[PDB]
Amino acid sequence: ILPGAAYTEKSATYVNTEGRAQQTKVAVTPPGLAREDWKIIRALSEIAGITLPYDTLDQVRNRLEEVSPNLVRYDDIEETNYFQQASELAKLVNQEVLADPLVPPQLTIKDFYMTDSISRASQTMAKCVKAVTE
Amino acid sequence: GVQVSPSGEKITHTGQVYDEKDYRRVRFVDRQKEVNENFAIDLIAQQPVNEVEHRIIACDGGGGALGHPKVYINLDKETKTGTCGYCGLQFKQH
Amino acid sequence: QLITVDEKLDITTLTGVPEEHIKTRKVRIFVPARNNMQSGVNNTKKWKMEFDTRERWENPLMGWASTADPLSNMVLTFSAKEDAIAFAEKNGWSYDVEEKKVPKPKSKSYGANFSWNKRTRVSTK
Amino acid sequence: LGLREIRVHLCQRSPGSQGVRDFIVQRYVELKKAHPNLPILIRECSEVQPKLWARYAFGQEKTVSLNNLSADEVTRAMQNVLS
Amino acid sequence: LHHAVIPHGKGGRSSVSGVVATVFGATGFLGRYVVNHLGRMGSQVIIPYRCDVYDIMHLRLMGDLGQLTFLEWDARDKDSIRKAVQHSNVVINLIGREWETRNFDFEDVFVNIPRAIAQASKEAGVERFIHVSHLNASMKSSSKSLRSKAVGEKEVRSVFPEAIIIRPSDIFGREDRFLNHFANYRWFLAVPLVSLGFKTVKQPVYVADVSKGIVNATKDPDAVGKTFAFTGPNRYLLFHLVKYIFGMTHRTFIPYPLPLFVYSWIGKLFGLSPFEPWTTKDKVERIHISDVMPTDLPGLEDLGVQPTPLELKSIEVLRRHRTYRWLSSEIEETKPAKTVNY
Amino acid sequence: KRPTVRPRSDVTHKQLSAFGEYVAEILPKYVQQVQVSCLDELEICIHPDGVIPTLTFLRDHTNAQFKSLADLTAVDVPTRQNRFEIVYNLLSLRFNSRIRVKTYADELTPIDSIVSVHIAANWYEREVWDMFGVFFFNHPDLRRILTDYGFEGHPFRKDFPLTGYVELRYDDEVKRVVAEPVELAQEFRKFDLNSPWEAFPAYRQPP
Amino acid sequence: TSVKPIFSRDLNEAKRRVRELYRAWYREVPNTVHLMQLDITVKQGRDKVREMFMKNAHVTDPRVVDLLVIKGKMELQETIKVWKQRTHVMRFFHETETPRPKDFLSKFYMGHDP
């Protein structure tokens, strides 16, 4: 096990459904011997023979620019296009739908308060569920 | 409320007793931790419930300028009893 | 007479601070967001300059929050963004800017609460 | 050794990227039908110089600035990448 | 791993390391540097003391609030040692004397007290134990101190394995009993040396080096069943070393030979003293046996300290002994000592 | 008649505005933005080339015998590019009135010294240098006063942290008072206190 | 761009003063090793002098160099005289402060900082 950090504990990008990249700012430092995640990966690499080229966070942002430069553009939605090609390209394949309905899993508010690890570990979410189911 | 823990230390009204593996018990060697015996939970629970006539009343601490700011408590419920915020005095009406 | 210094203005050797809090430190220039518990907007209207937070730990004696960095509570106040950019470039710090956020102007009407056709017909008062 | 990922970078409005957009709308479906298991990532931004990256077996990447390049020249550089 | 022994901070005062340590010879000469190097990075240091509180004041500092806990003890009385190691991770034995007393002999300093301390450490459940023997510690040696120290080094393994046994040479420092001891031979108008100092080799070490070594060994995942030879560089021949001492201390130098039996009798009648003696038979014996070539063992550089030459730190020790007319003299005016390898 | 609020005068306001016109029209080459506060205080603002002539003028003129220096200060304002707003507080003793003279500076735009006018300004200029870093030309000594000897920094700047960058304690290894990097057993709890409601519309900075 | 000078037309006229200052420090060090009973060698003192000079060798603005010359002349005043002590003089050497690592992995092993 390699303890990482949380969104309250690392400057990090998280792209939304729109595509807007958004930078977290570190509030509290992670506890114990827990560290940032890319930091752990680069340390692993240096213990191996790889030794990834970057040492700091801005270098990682340069790498993100090299891969996908929609990410450094914080709070900057960018107009995408080229849906007609995907239409032409999906019209080819022949996978058929089922004659079976589709219920979402979050069917009621009872299933909203617990969706991930953090919400699973929560006295308040559990109190809310205890109140919703009763 | 001065129950002890299996380690042997005293416990405060804030359940605080150092764990058996905590190195910060050294400071209590040839020494002692100051912990108060008179708990406020027990001592405010060892008080009666003040029957009153009205449905709204006023609670100062009891000395006027020596108590707390004058607040007002409703007593319409009968499932429970009113309770001051500053002090913990309880009230009811018949 | 005058002097032809075209290169960037630099002051780091004069402030007498160490290299760590010049190169390692990152700055955030921003207009502080409104506290949503209040509808007041005067704690906005000025730009600021914070530093990246660092490790805070508990002193084993009492539990006090300790620090090893002195720029924990460093907060400055500027009236424009150009001035803060200038100050950060001048003191050798690397910055990251948050452009201004203004609320949209909205068409408010009290008579829309009593509509005949629309769904703005509120049912309480 | 072998090719694993291509990815293209461009703009929607800077004319130095034109020839890449035309190349996309002309040849992308053909290229994907030719290479249905390969991924090739098209990511467009506001104001950047176009590029073309080629991700080989290890972390081995190769750039070529195809700025102000007609679509035929784009396709030629791309076939040079593929071969 | 308890949450309170997790290291935090930038490695300094007002920080945390997880190095809760009982240091038993803390009121001495090496222990003060050990406690200083521990408090300098943030670490609780339990310090058992039998002396008067006047002689623990210099240790009252060198640590942030609550990180220095003193409690009184007695080697005769067990339950004054379990009480100390009850909450610790590390234990560092520095106990030692350069003379016997009516109450405590060398056996009852180097053998029976480490055995008790290590028994208490194993029963309490601590992780480490740093014992400090001597480089020349050998069961077939000439001195009661050295044989007792080898016996203790063996019995500590027999009781508490997973231990660390450091074997320094004769240490020098500001308030040592090595350079000051050779420099106080000016009050006698000539210095005696067995065989005029030749056929004797000394490889001294500095206090800071041993202290940093101990303070890293209490954090190194290595050094669990390893002995060490804290020797330092520049093996020296005794005549040239005393000549360097009496040049840096610019007084004079009148050497002359002396046998070992009469110098032993001198040490004996000097050790006839209720106070701290100036000389003893075991001290003469320990002075006039050479230091082992230590290259069969790791040393400092296998632990994270680059050893310090005597020539760079000796003036700090020896300027105390100078007079006026020489006190304002520098390090580079003493034609340094002649080194040997042998 | 209003007991809670302060009583206001008229004659002092008129007097000091007239004297501001006087100084303005008599010393135009150096003067900027003469002003008179609500409370009766005159405040002249000066180009740094005008320090010695303005101070000598107010010291030695007959209608302006400002021959006693009360303070020489500075105010670090990182917003304006010329940060340090250097101030001179002077009194007359012939007319029983005070005046304020101001000029600006930067880390690399020093100012003429004033010891040729008021000898009081020696230690005050040394203090401004020690605290803000404003060099002063043709000053006799111009060394620190208040800070430690081997001190790196100009404290009363706003860009300097309150707790400093170094910390002291005595080490037995070296037998000295060594300077170590700052590390607090308790971080200074900064508080955000400015209410988000305009209390003073008269000073309403418009957008 | 068209700014005022202080004690300097441009960089060579300032490097002149810089070398004068290095000269004064080099001549002064052996007197301070003697007056205040320092326990170091004259070589490492002058090495510290050259080090604290090279800490500012990356700069080009003449005004910065002039203010640095001024600060160094102040320090040289305090050091020629014995206003300051063995403490403030040995405060340059960092004889207690453990060396701040410059490797990634040690930083990762102790601390969250870069």
Ligand SMILES: NC(=O)C1=CN([C@@H]2O[C@H](COP(=O)(O)OP(=O)(O)OC[C@H]3O[C@@H](n4cnc5c(N)ncnc54)[C@H](OP(=O)(O)O)[C@@H]3O)[C@@H](O)[C@H]2O)C=CC1
């Ligand atoms: N030149 C040197 O110093 C060298 C030392 N060593 C080893 O280093 C270790 C420490 O050296 P050093 O620091 O000089 O020793 P010190 O004599 O300087 O101080 C040793 C400590 O031992 C304690 N002590 C001694 N006898 C007893 C006793 N009978 N009961 C309880 N406590 C006792 C003293 O406590 P108090 O003073 O309060 O009684 C003192 O604090 C020793 O183990 C020694 O073998 C090895 C080589 C060189």
Ligand SMILES: [Zn+2]
């Ligand atoms: Zn009440």
